[PDB]
């Protein structure tokens, strides 16, 4: 089938950890949640300044 | 006229009628009583969302001797309905000149904020209004009618589309038929 093997979340016996998935429905809205999308970009809220500010330097000068 | 062919008749007369609004209505393809039952609107009532432009074709049914120019305007939501020709003329309009070509199309562009609109249009998803006026007037020779009929046709464009399947509110019953 259109099987798609992904990686499972670390277990309590770490340091065959993968699962299989197949969509049965025609609408993408039927698929399960995307609990594995780990994107980040705090810059939008933490550093929305026009002029890049270097940590080790004075904010104003 | 709810049960006569006069319901489709849009009279136009000879003589001074400047400042007079020939007709007007809202742009609710599925809610407006004017479109509510046309092939177009009749289908929209099986859906809750709609989008796209509309083609309002007007046909002059007067005699071959009658002449005239009408101003077909369309005003997007936001202001009051055009009370004068000047106000209507400020919006998307089409000056139709009656001649050999009987019909004239007034394509109402899809100028909405959102991508779709509800067939059960509310003030938020308002579409605007359409008002018709006399650009000049209807001149006619002697021995010729002074009143003429102007039919109106409505249909969707190649950019039209419905989206939310629902049941039409134009049919029901109180018990199993027999």
């Amino acid at each position: 089938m259109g099987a798609q093997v992904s990686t499972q979340k670390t277990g309590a016996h770490e340091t065959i950890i993968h699962y299989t998935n197949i969509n049965y429905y025609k609408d993408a809205a039927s698929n399960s949640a995307n609990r594995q999308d780990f994107t980040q970009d705090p810059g939008k809220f933490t550093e929305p300044v026009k002029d890049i500010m270097i940590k080790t330097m004075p904010a104003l000068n | 006229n709810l049960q006569s062919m006069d319901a489709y008749h849009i009279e136009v007369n000879t003589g001074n009628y400047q400042g007079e609004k020939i007709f007007a209505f809202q742009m609710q393809p599925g809610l407006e009583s004017v479109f509510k039952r046309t092939l177009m609107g009749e289908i929209l009532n099986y859906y809750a969302h709609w989008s796209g432009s509309i083609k309002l074709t007007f046909t002059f049914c007067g005699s071959a001797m009658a002449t005239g120019k009408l101003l077909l305007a369309y005003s997007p939501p936001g202001a009051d309905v055009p009370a004068t020709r000047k106000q209507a003329m400020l919006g998307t309009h089409m000056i139709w000149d009656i001649g050999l070509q009987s019909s004239c199309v007034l394509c109402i562009p899809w100028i909405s904020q959102t991508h779709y609109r509800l067939v059960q249009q509310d003030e938020y998803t308002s579409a605007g209004n359409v008002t018709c006026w006399y650009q000049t007037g209807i001149v006619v020779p002697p021995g010729t009618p002074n009143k003429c009929v102007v039919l109106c046709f409505a249909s969707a464009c190649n950019d039209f589309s419905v989206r939310m399947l629902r049941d039409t509110p134009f049919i029901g019953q109180t018990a199993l038929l027999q």
Partner: protein, 252 residues
């Protein structure tokens, strides 16, 4: 068939099934001001579709005794949508304009109008000893009309047609961009006027770039029971509208 034509500017469209070609100013077509001809250093504003669209003015009635009418632009469009708003807020302006005069009758009516665009149509006063008032030269979209006889007004314009209120012969107005509306063949007249002036730009309230005159050379006539109401509507659309010198709106 070159009889039928269609005009589209902005959100406006005009239709015709009995036109007679299209006169294009002095062979030129409206165009924006070039850098090698500009003077105003500030970057101009070009509303485009916002101001460059068809504006219909108050219709006029053509009667068996009508002598003519005239409008002055861009003044006549001071209260027309955004085109008029830019005139108020800006010191300098520049536009093209597409004049489209409509007037239909029937194969049983007769008459012939002369649609002309007269650049710098400086007019004279009724009383040669006095001066004229702006109020008598142009009054918004309201048209002033020519009279078949001499006028007497204090500061009125010499409306006597034969002289077109300019001290010249009406039969020679054909030297200006024009067209006729011979009811037996026509139905309207279109003229594309290019910006004509001795300066790149100019104020639009203080200066009346050109005057549109509609003078009938063939009196409107018809038989009994034939529609007696024959209106003449004028529609004009600015082209390549540019504006400079933005400031507080001018109080009319």
């Amino acid at each position: 068939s070159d009889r039928v034509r269609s005009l589209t500017l902005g959100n406006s469209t005009i239709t015709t099934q009995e036109s007679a070609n299209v006169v294009v100013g002095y062979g030129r077509w409206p165009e924006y001001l070039r850098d090698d001809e500009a003077t105003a250093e500030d970057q101009p504003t070009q509303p485009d579709v916002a101001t460059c669209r068809f504006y219909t003015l108050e219709s006029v009635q053509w009667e068996k005794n009508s002598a003519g009418w005239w409008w002055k632009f861009p003044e006549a469009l001071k209260d027309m949508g955004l085109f008029g708003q830019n005139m108020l807020y800006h010191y300098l302006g520049r536009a093209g304009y597409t004049i489209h005069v409509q007037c239909n009758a029937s194969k049983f009516h007769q008459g012939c109008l002369l649609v002309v665009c007269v650049p710098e149509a400086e007019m004279g006063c009724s009383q040669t000893d006095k001066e004229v008032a702006a109020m008598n030269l142009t009054k918004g979209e309201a048209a002033h009309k020519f009279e078949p006889t001499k006028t007497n007004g204090e500061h009125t314009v010499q409306s006597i047609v034969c002289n077109a209120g300019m001290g010249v012969g009406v039969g020679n107005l054909t030297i200006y961009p024009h067209q006729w509306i011979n009811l037996r063949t026509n139905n309207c007249a279109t003229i594309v006027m290019p910006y004509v002036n001795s300066v790149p730009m100019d104020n639009m309230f203080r200066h009346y770039n050109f005057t549109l005159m509609v003078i009938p050379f063939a009196p409107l006539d018809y038989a009994a029971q034939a529609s007696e109401y024959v209106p003449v509507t004028v529609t004009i659309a600015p082209m390549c509208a540019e504006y400079n010198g933005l400031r507080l709106a001018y109080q009319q």
